[model samples]
Structures are given as structure tokens and as C-alpha cells.
Target chain A: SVLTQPPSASGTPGQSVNISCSGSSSNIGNSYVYWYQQLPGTAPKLLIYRNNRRPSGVPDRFSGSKSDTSASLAISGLRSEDEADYYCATWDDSLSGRLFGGGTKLTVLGQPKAAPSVTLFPPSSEELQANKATLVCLISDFYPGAVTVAWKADSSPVKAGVETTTPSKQSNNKYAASSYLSLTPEQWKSHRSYSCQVTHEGSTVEKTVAP
Target chain B: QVHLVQSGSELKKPGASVKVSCKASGYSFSRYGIKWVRQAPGQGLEWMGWINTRSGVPAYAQGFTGRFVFSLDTSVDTAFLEISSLKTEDTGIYYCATRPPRFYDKTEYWEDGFDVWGRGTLVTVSSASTKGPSVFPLAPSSKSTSGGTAALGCLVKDYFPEPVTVSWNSGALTSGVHTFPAVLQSSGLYSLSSVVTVPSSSLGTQTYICNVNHKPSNTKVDKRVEPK
Candidate 1:
């Protein structure tokens, strides 16, 4: 098995935050350390490898170090875009295997929360004939990134046929999430109203549209 | 021509057992390792664990501890995932994927990321069945500036319920696009690449859209081509 990481780490812009990973001597003490950064809904990226070496194009703001049976990853000059999930990995000689840290979420503090701009786009005409129509709910320009999207059909909660994307950072530092709802054309036309509700930071923003 | 073909859908009750197989072909199967991925109903992808094909070493993910087993048949070039005493939450699709071997100082290492995948085998735990698929970005595309023509490549990965349509469009002009065949990943999901080329004059001042349509999800994801 691999080491475990702290659940979370927090820091403000320009501040520094460090996350620690702990393992046994059979693992950390004998092998190299690697780090991965995963933004929501995206694949994990190799951030730091071989304990301290950054891969090409990685920013200098991130640094890693190891001592004894523990490893640490430090992020300086934290920005809104730096908020992500970080994982530590190391090779274990005991099992001749590789182990991973549970994962740590980095939160950049002091950012103002903003309501997402929600838009609901109806499915195309051809989609209706196939017994499969898609309704898209695009939530954009939201701050604090963490948000939940839900679908409602005719004032009832709709659980099936829903897929929500992980919030993605935009060039403006805001976040965007896209949710898709799949339904038959008959269900789409018969429903009185379909709504996309986005909840972020204790507030909810909704957009309702009719077929 | 390396391929990973998976088993068929299964309908098993709780406390029952189900074992899925992945048959490899057209490559040296023993040269790579196999990993399993799980996708519960309406949930994201999860990495279960992997098995070293050469040796019988098995490592598991956090959630997949006791009842999960990864074994192999070296003579037949096949891998297997067997789950015992299944629970209702186990209802979803399971995929078997491949990972290329990484070598350092004569010691081979199993790296992450599924370079290929097998078509997923659905597992239904109860009366109701799950539907739809999840499509995620692989890598953002980089545009070409040094070439005579402008070329753009987009990669979309980890999608289920196969047969995804990919197209490239610029205004009213839809060009002939090239789509590489989908590759199976260790997680039992499919990934594919699509490329479109246009005259360099259309590089700037024009917007190119790479649209992917998945039937099961009844959704189309549009990725805009951005200049590097």
C-alpha cells in the first residue's frame, strides 16, 4: 500500500502552502517520490517526479522535498488556478510495487464568491427522432469553482440521464461547468418545464426552459 | 493492431459472483500490464488496480480490497477480473486496459495512463439498468505554425457505450476529417483522436470546432481550436 495525504491545504494568493505525505521506511525511505496534480474532471498530470525534479513546462512555484519516511510538496505564489487535487506517489521495495497517497485538495483562499451565469440550450431536431435528445446547461463565470448541478423536470427531481463536468478554470480565473441531460423527445415535449439548478457557496442559481 | 476485447454484459444478483475476461491480440501481451476500472451508475471513473502480466503480482486500489481478484492466463494471452459476493453498488461497467512497460536501470516499472482499452462489459446488479457514458478531455490541442497547412488534433478519451462521432467544422465548410480508431484502456473505456487540416490562410480570423457526438449520452461536446 501507499502513503496517505492530508485531506486539504489552504493558502491565499502569494502565500505558500505545503502538503505532507507519510509512508513507511519500506517504501519512502528506499524509493523515489513523484507528485501528480488533478484538476476537477480532468486526468491527473505528473507534476513533480524523482522527488524534486519538475517536468518540462511545470511552473517553478511548485517544489517537492523528502526526509526520512515522509515527503512534502510546497506551492508558493498560490493563485486561483492553482486550486486542485494533489497526490503523492512512491515506489515500494517491499512489494516491488508503486504506491499512491490518498490525495490532498489545495484551496486558494480569499476569493470572492460569484453566482454562475446559467444557460440552458435545447436539443437539436435530429436528436428528437432518435429517442435521445440532449439538454445542455452551461454554468460559467463562477467563483470558488466548487458547485453542484441538478436537473428538474416538471418540478420533480430527475436523477437519471445526467452528467456534470468538473469545473474548469478559464483565462479570467473564473470557473465553468457543463451539465448534460439526456431524454427522449416525447419526455422533452411533454414536460411543462425543465430547469438546471446550480448551487455554489450556499446560493442557488437556476435557469428553466421549455421545449 | 494491438487489441483488447472484453466479455459480454452480465446480470448477477447480490452475493453472486461474476468474472470478466479481456483477450489480447496482435501484440506481445506479456510485455504490458493490465488494469481494471470501475464506473458505477451515474458516477465518474475509478481506478481499481492492476496485475503484472509476467509475474502474478496484484495491487489494488483503496476501495477494491478483498473480494476483487485479478488473474491471468499467460498461455491464452488473457486477463481476468473476478468479483465475489457482489453488492448492489457494483452495478456498472468494468473495463480492462493496458499500460506500456517503463524501464529504468534494467528494472521495468508500470506507469499510469491507459494507452489502450477494451470495450466495457456492463454489470447489472438489480432490476434497473444504467445508461449513458462519460467523455473527458485527454489533452488540449496545439496548432501548427511552421507547416504549410494549418493542422489541429483533438483527443477525447474514457467514453463508454461506443460508436462516437467526431467532426470538424469551420463556418459553413465542413472538411473531410480523419478519425483514428478508438483504443481500449485498462479501465474498459475507449479513447480516440481526430485531426483536421486546412489551408494556413484559415488559421487566424477563423474558428474551428471539433464536435463529438456520443449516442448513449445523446450529447455533443464542442471543443474549439485555439492557436498555440
Candidate 2:
């Protein structure tokens, strides 16, 4: 059978969280198991190889163990920085190949979160001549990044033409990302306000661009 | 990311005109442009020209100007491409693309890279009844000329109103399985293929089964690839 992992897992700093990988005796029970951690937009780094063996750069706080058909990855003293995706790999004699579980999204929740500084950039003159306008929402300097961004035009939820990037970890250990809202000159001038709504830590931040 | 969600696959008559829709979301309708590209299955990718996002004007490629018209409906954040005098050759995948890259953020990029797009709308113009997909089983791959690992898959072709679902023995045979998006075939229909990695030792001993379900045709077929 193929490996399976829960889609979501959560913990807070100083909490010990366990993510599991389930398999049959044909795999995790007898063969070696491994664990890997993937940060956003980066390659997966080996955390545990060959069952419980920790890799060179990985900290000792992460441990891997197996019992019969079940495998567990334990992250002790979880920190906000440890938020990432976790995956388990193992060799199965029945399939005569290796397999990786459907990764688990680990979020260190309830930690301190900072508001992203939201800046709205309206259309440039060059953009206007193209018969279109592009509004940019530069969202930066947010700690423990997790935000939901949306667009609105004159209080109506704008249904289309918004593009937001995944938050990139900035030099300040804070995360930054941007959202784009495309508008027409007709809509730009016809509407009173165009807005970018960002939700961080249960609070919504509204940045409006006037016509 | 900006996304263009277009209307579903359409089946039309040979003499009809088709107006395909691309509804924009996660972006504004007035700030940019939309490109309508046509790929007639086996034919080369042809630029169908771009429609001005706000001004409601359209620029057309040489061959597509008259027959292909791009229109915008900002009232609902949607872009429309109406193709008139539809013929058998007009049956293919029509993609809805957005204005070129023009962001000047931390890193500047030009032309292409994470550009906004839709899962190309599959437009089929036929006089015949809607055809169902033909499922063909491929020999399980323990080793191939590409020096790859073990795999089992099937080729599903010539289907109309695509939105087919493929499964391997009710999920017993997954993990390393990839199903490619449905591609418009020369026959003016669609074809999709899926493959799953199997155990090298198990490949020769296990007969893999996959079920292909085509909803429009209400057909459910279980294809079996006999063990080698």
C-alpha cells in the first residue's frame, strides 16, 4: 500500500508534536524509514535517514521511529521557525520501490504574529496607455507569516484579476509578499475605491486606492 | 497568483459560433489585457491576439482577426472569445491568457514566468454524436529505454466534454501516480494518460486494474493490464 499522512498538523513552541506515516508491514514494519522537511519554495532537506538516524545539519529535536505498520516523526520543543511541510519516505519490498507520504503541513500556531505593512501602487502612465491599469499591494514585514489576501472594488468583492505571490522570508526574519489587481481605466475612474484586504492573525487590514 | 477560470468544455454544431468565457479572479478586470490563443489539437500554437482589458478593444493575429473576436464584460470580470463560422477544424483547445508580465517589485521579470492563464477550454465542434473516450492499457513498465522505475498506466483518448476521472483499483495503487491533463487530439476530441509507479518485483506478478469514469457519457470502465 502507498504511504499516507494527515494533511495538517499543528503545535506551539515548547510543544511536542507527532506526525504519522501509515504503511503496511511490507514497508515501514521491516524496511528503513526516513523523514524530510520542506520549507516554502525550497528543496526538501533530509531530517532523519535510516529510521531514527538524524542527518548532519538537522537538529536533535527531530526524531523518527517506527513500530510495525506505523511510523512517527516527533518534533520536540517546536518553534515558530519550524513551521513547514513534513514528509516520510520508506522502501517497500512488495512494491520493490521507494515511496514518500503525501506530506503534512505543519503550522506552529498561536505564536505572536505581526501585521504586514500594506502599500498600494496604482497604475503607472505606461500601464494606462496600454488601455489597462495594474494596482499592486506590497505586503511586507510580517512575522510568522500566514495571511489571506483579497480584492474589492467600491465595496463589492472583486471576483477576478488578482494575483498574489507566496510570502518570501525577508532579511528581517519577517515575510513579505505582493498582490496585484488589474483594472480598466473605465472601471478605475467609475469606481470610487479599489481595495486590498489582507487578513493576518484573525485581523483584517484594508488598504484602499482612490480613483 | 492570478488565475483565469474559463467555462467548461463545449460541444457545438459545425455551422455554429462559439463564445468561450474566461472569468477572472484574484485580479482586477480593468488593469490589464487578456489573450485568446487557439491550438487546434495537432496544429501549431497560434496567437489569437489580445483584448484590451478596460478600453474594450481587441488586437488580432493575422489569421484570426475576423473569425476570432475578443470582448470584455467588466460587469462580471470576464473575457469573451467568440469564434464565428465554426468548422471541424475549429475543434481544439482554446487558451485564455493574460497581459504580459509588467510588475516592478523587488525582482523584475519580463514576458513570461508565472503568467496568468486558464486550463485551456476544450471546444469541440462536431455534427456527430458525442464520442466517449477509448481506454487502452499500457504494458506495466518495470524498466524502460529511459532507464526508469516500474510503472503502470493507460492511454484514454478521443473523448468529448472531458472531465474524466481515473483511479487505480480504488486507490490501492497510488503514490507516484501522475495523470496528465487532457490534451486535444487530432480527431477533435481529447486524450489523457495516467501512470503509477509499482514495485519492480510486483510488476511481473500483479495485474493492475484502473477504472476510468467519463461522466458525460455515463461510462465506467475497468481496464486491466495483465501481468508480464
Candidate 3:
């Protein structure tokens, strides 16, 4: 059998929702549980999964956990984009590819969950100072497979000399990927706002970073 | 559209291998990449990496490589991943995936994670016969002059009617046979926990592992206890 979302719920801009999945032993006991989020009228992206692993494109605010037969997807520090529907899935050979839970709808309110955080490798303290400043964006914990990351400034499409990378499984069950863009410090300084937008399965999410 | 559907369940003995396939039909064969994921039974999803359909470029998550192979055939638009050296821990659902559309429009799209997922294939690693717990040393319960007696506890879930080994780090002390009842109500019921006492001397050196013997080898080791 298949699982789905419970119902529609409301929340402020930064508030979050907890979505749960109830499954039979065949799916839950034997499969890996995963979570995905879909914005209104857009494709779905992965949120959380088994290794407590987050994709390179996902924010840290979104997380996942499993207790017995129940697996859950949690989106903390919610944002307006978080307002879309959330889902849980698993790897069930019986069904073939991958299985997903019904889904949960999250409404972003308040401060957009304090802007989900990330851990930069090599801990670069050095800033790239130049005529144009550049910022590297990452998104993690998304699902559905199909996705692209775009860059924008103040609602305008910023020319992103962008490069994309896919997730490579890491030790300890972590999955990660990355993308990069170099902008003039002036372009970056002027916009003050930058977004890494992900589009998948018709769903789109814009994760904006303020200067 | 040719949706890549997966089987729901699989059972294999320890030291065995399982190959799960994701069959696709909708678009042309070379349009997308097929990704694979692994979730411990009743756990969250973990990206096991992806396989490019056009180029057969395969990437794997850590600790899962050398045991899994992601391959594709453009002519068939189908992808296959074979997992071997099976141990009980390897039991869980395996999913196949594809990249979103926008990923193709831009250069170097961030994976974020898998968005599309195959229903998942369930593989169970078990021994045809159950084994009783092995005998090992127990922790010494002496209060240290500087510190108090140290006690260690572990929790394991999902497995049933089988004996699990709980080994602490200080020495090779093993806990007695134990049963853990399920705390979260869901399918494939049952949970387990075990405890062992340690001297302050052994506290920092040990980790407690709940080891199960099955295909894909499953083991949960907790190394939280460190000496102060």
C-alpha cells in the first residue's frame, strides 16, 4: 500500500510543521525512510533521509528521524517556501524504485526559520574581495531526483556563472553535492539579497540569503 | 510514462548479494541520471549516490562503496544497482532516482538531494537460524577513588526473537540476552536495549555496539561515552 499526507495545516512565516509516516512492516521495517517537500504548483525536492544525510542543496533547518515503524520529516525555522507540501518516502524493492509518504504542508511565517544554516568545508575564513563579491550557494536534503539550482538578485536573475554537482555518498551515510557562482563584489553588494532556487518535478523553491 | 517501479520485499542470508533494478519507460534513454538511495529499515533516506544514464558515471556515499555498483543501459533507458557482500545491516529499502528538469538547464546544479524516487526495494539480511548471545566479560563495578562506577546502556530496535550482541569498549564485555519493546508503533514491530556497567577506567575507551549477523551486515555502534 502507499502512504500520503494527513491534511492541510497553517503556520506563520518562520514556523515549521512536523510530517509523519505510518507504514506496514514490509515498507518501513524493510526499507529506508525519506522526506521531500513540494511548493504550490512546483516539483518536489528531497528533505531528509536515512543517513541523517542532507543533500548539498538542502538547508540545515530541514531534518528527519525514525522511531520504529514511524519516520518523520521536520522543517525548522520555516520560510514561505516551506509553506508547500512535505512528503516521506522509502526504498522498497517490492515497489521497485523509491517509495514516498503521503506528504505534509508547511507554511512559512515569522523570520523564515532563521535561514537554515550550513557547514562549509575547510572552514574558509578568507573572503573573496574584488570589484564583484561572490557567494557560493548550497541546497541539501531534497527528493524526487529532478532539480536545478538557479541564482537571482533582488528578484532579478543574476548572471550566475553557475556550475552544478551531484551528491556522492560520504562515510557515515551522508549524501552531498554542490554548485558555484562568481559575481562582482559590486553586484553582490548592490543586491544584498541572493537566492539559490531549486526546481524539480514542477516545484520550485527559492532560498534567499540577505547581505 | 515508464515509471521505474520496485519490488516491496527481499530476504537474503548473511554473506549474500542482491541486485535491484529500476526500469524506466517515459522519455528517451539519455535524458537523465539514475540515482540510488539507502534507508535502514524504518530510518530516513541516505543518498547512496547516482549513475549517469548517458555516461555511466557512478558516485557512491561513504561506507557504502565497494559494495554497491550503479550501472545503466541507454538503449533500455533502464538503470541497475547491484549490492554485494550482504550483511544484515545492509537490509533496508533501495531507491532509484532521476535529476529534476532545471538541473539540465543550468550548469552544475546542486543535488540538494534526490527529488524523484523509485518506490524502493526491501532487502532483508538474516541467518536462516538464530544464534544465542555469546559469553564475554562483564564490567567491573568498582567505584573509582576519583570517580564513581560507570554504567553504559544501549538501545536497539526492529529485530525480533534473535539474540543480539552488545559489546562495550573498555574491555570485551558483553551483555546478557535482552529484549527491547517497540516505543514507536509502526510495522515490523519490536525493539531492544542492553546495558553494561564499566569502571571509570574503561568509560572513555569503549563503545557499545548492537551487532546482528545478516546479509549486508547491520551493526549499530554508539561511541558517545568518552572519558572526562
Candidate 4:
């Protein structure tokens, strides 16, 4: 079973966590990934599946992604039930059964992870007018081992102009880190704003910046 | 805008009976149909059958024939389905699907699967009378009380103000008239636990039924008890 284990806690209620599961082979080989949540006395609710499709009743905050030999479940804006055990299951013909990765337990920390913190630091204020502006977004202090960052405009895809990365060593011997995203204003205004979402530790956060 | 909501979870004893319902809201009461689906926890979805919202025409899957009923009301846009003779394999998540605006053939869209599905109602089979029985199967029991009545109950879960009927191998019985009282749930779904007694000598041959009448369709019967 290619199981994913997120670092125990990610953020306070409402923050995002990213969890990663690595399969012996790429999920594209089978293209089925289902996420579920188990509360104290209730049955598990299906969260995300088949890459990014949401079942009819599932809320949109629950999202999924895939890359290489791994799949991810990013839960945004954590809740009480979000504190329950979260598992990722995928289909494998060889196993002839659904395999689940070890779960992630979300415990609300400080100020409930802010919706997604998106801000644009432009190379210069002059660039904001000429049909486009260039801005840099800094994402920091998150958990869950696997994370994917992308720039999106109004639900569509945009380009990431530049990338900056950094890492911090925790006293517990774990790691905390962040990365930077650079995009142009022409892309920003096309869709109300630009959104940067990260998934890991079972939490997802999208920060938007414009004007 | 009609919404279909399901009742809560249920736990029943083996060989007992349980019923669950899906309540509909919004839209004109008779324009659309209500459908039922059964999915075992953590498994793929399965089509159980559907009930006509205006006329109550019922169609069932192969293995599930005869033990369930579907009905509807055009005036209220609500429909109900009842299952009797509860068994362990019945434990699953039952969802109410919104039938298409028009009926499509088996090769068409709605004919293959349901698109709009309810949040889903969970029903579990356990060993106790969690909600009481809706219609009991007329099977012989060793723990029968002589000279006493056996309160064989079937728990009917959904459909409000529905026309409910109980039948026996001997004859058919409609509840909530001048005799038996029906159990109602908060979601506008109704449940009836019918009780019938054996004369002590002929305890092995009587059967009971819970039939419900809805709209866009006719009547559906949940047959209980079989000659053992």
C-alpha cells in the first residue's frame, strides 16, 4: 500500500494541511484516488476521488491532485470533523482491493489558518498599469510532507513566472518551509485575482491577490 | 427546487423489518420522480429502483424484487419507498436521487445512472429494536408467548401523509384508520409497526405486508413473513 503520513498537526481550525501518498506506480496507471473522513460514531464520508472530481454531496473545499507516483488530498479551512482521521484510498488491480494510506489527524492550532493568504509583492509599482503587473507571493509555515503550488485565475490556469524556496529545521527534528510564486499583472486582472493553493497534512489553503 | 432528504440511521435485529424514507421539497409536486439507490459503505453505487412522483410506477432490480414499494404525491413533490424483512446485508447508505425531467431509455442518460443525489441516509442492521419493526415476517419463533399476541412490527421510514397498507397471507390490512397508530419521524417520513398474533396452533403460515401509496405511481408492498 502506497500510504501517506502527514506530520501530526498542521494549523488551527480553518488552516490547510497537505498529505501525500506515494504508490509503487503512478496513479495515472489506474486514475482512481478516493479520500474519506471518519468521525467518532459516524461512517466515513467520501471526500475526493478520480484525481479532482467531487462526489455530489461533498463540499468543494475538499480537493485532490496527482503527480508522478503520488496522489494528494488537500482539505481547506479545517473544521471539528476535520479533526477526525483522514485516509486516502486508491484502486489497484494487483491488490484487487482498495488500499488506504495512514491517516492525518488535524488539530486546530493558533488563529484558524487564514482562508488562503494571497498577497502580491510587485518587482515595482510601475508594472501595475502596463496591461500587466508582476507580483510575488510567499507561502510559509505548513505541514503534511507533499505540497503542490500553482497560480490560477478565475478557476483557470495561469503561469508561475519565478520560484523561491527556503526551509527551517524544527527543534523536534522535523522541517517547516515555504516557497515564492511570481506572476504578471496581465494574468492577475484577467481573473478577478490570482490564487496560490497548497495541500499537505490534509489541509488546503488558497491565497488570492489583485489590484 | 424540490429537495429530497433522507431519514436517520437504523439498527434492527436479524429477521426483523426496517423501513427508510426520502422526503422531497420545492418544485411542483408532480413534475419529477424520486429514485432510491443502495451503496454499501465504502463501495461503488448501485441502482435499487425508482418511484414515480405523480403516478407511483415502481420498477425494481433483480434481487430486490417484491420486498419493497414505491409511491409519490404530485401535490407535494414527495415519494416514499419501504423495505420489509430486514437482513444483515441491508446495511448501507441509501440515497434518494432526483429523477430526470423526462424518462430516458436504458441507453439514454437517466436510464444508466442518477446525476443529482441526496446527501444520503444511513441504515444499519443490528440485533435490537432501535426504532421498532415496520412489518414483521410471519416466521416461526421459539420464544412465542402462549395465549399472547406477537407484536410483529415493521419500521417504515419515509413518505409523509402516505397511504400505508399492511397485508397478510390471510388478507391485507391498512393501518392508522380506526385501529393501529403509525409512527412518524421528524422529517415528515412515517413508520408503522404492525402487530399480529398467531392463534398458537397455526404459527408457521401467516405473512404480513407494509404497502405505501405515493404519487405518479400506484402502491408498493413490503412483504413480511413466509411459510417456513
Index of the highest-DockQ prediction: 3
Q: Compose the digit string of candidate 4's lDDT tens values, residues B103-162.
A: 433123222223345777777665432222223232332232335433233333333444
User: Looking at model 2 chain A, which ten-residue stretch has the lowest summed lDDT?
Assistant: A119-128
Q: Indicate the docking level reached by candidate 4.
A: incorrect
TM-score of chain A of each: 0.71, 0.83, 0.47, 0.47
State fnat for each of the candidate structures: 0.00, 0.00, 0.13, 0.00
- Worst lDDT 10-window in candidate 4 chain A: A114-123
For all predicted structures, in order, the TM-scores are 0.46, 0.45, 0.34, 0.31
Question: Mind giving the per-residue lDDT tens digits that candidate 3 earns over B103-171?
Answer: 463222224332456777878776643322221121222331225555333334334433454444444
> What ranges in model 1 sit over 4 Å off?
A10-17, A24-27, A54-61, A76-83, A91-98, A107-112, A116-141, A147-211, B1-32, B35-50, B55-66, B73-78, B91-228
Q: Can you write out model 2's per-residue Cα lDDT over B1-228, one digit (the tens) per residue?
A: 467788898889888888999999775666557877665643334456788787898877557768888888899999999999888888888878765433432111111222445777888788655677767665554432123456566666558766899999877877666565554433446665666667766665667887899998888879886543
Considering the two chains of model 1, state its CAPRI-style docking category: incorrect
TM for candidate 1 is 0.46
Where model 3 places Cα greater than 4 Å from the true spot, the runs are A1-211, B101-103, B106-115, B129-228
Candidate 3 chain A lDDT trough over 10 residues, lowest sum = A116-125
